[PDB]
Design a protein around this ligand. Sequence first.
Ligand SMILES: Nc1ncnc2c1ncn2[C@H]1O[C@H](COP(=O)(O)OP(=O)(O)OC[C@H]2O[C@H](O)[C@H](O)[C@@H]2O)[C@@H](O)[C@@H]1O
Length: 167
Amino acid sequence: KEKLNAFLVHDNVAFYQGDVDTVVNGVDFDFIVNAANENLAHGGGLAKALDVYTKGKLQRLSKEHIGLAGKVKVGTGVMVECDSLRIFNVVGPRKGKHERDLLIKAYNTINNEQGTPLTPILSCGIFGIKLETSLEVLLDVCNTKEVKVFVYTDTEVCKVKDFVSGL
Ligand SMILES: Nc1ncnc2c1ncn2[C@H]1O[C@H](COP(=O)(O)OP(=O)(O)OC[C@H]2O[C@H](O)[C@H](O)[C@@H]2O)[C@@H](O)[C@@H]1O
């Protein structure tokens, strides 16, 4: 039914592997989360790849927002529609002393946005938070409705399987 099969299911969370175009095309979701920074300056990782997908519309709209009242608290998400695609720009934390308390806030913003999210594991790339830590918060917060999670590299895939195995 859904084009791309999940590699793993845990409780109400389903895990997928691909780049942006693969997951946007292959996964059934109401909105995709972007692991953004407080500037909504999409320079790297998933943020760049989502911007490229939208052919710059995302960055253009981000600038607009960033912008109006005013710029963006760690997070705290900003929904934008780029044609069919709804992108929920959520400011995950940088690694640091409050990382857990802020991952909690970010995942809660995600879990409380209406619809089935497709989300990355926040902060686990350029922000340098341990994948398993961020994932642990994700699962703790997102404990009711169906939520879909994507990762990118085969390394991250093994990390998810292994962590979920420990549960
Ligand atoms: N081309 C891609 N397609 C799909 N997923 C990707 C891609 N590139 C990176 N990802 C990543 O998305 C997830 C989160 O990684 P990052 O994008 O590095 O996000 P984060 O660690 O939250 O750091 C955010 C920072 O990086 C961006 O430049 C963004 O503007 C912000 O400054 C990771 O699971 C996964 O490796």
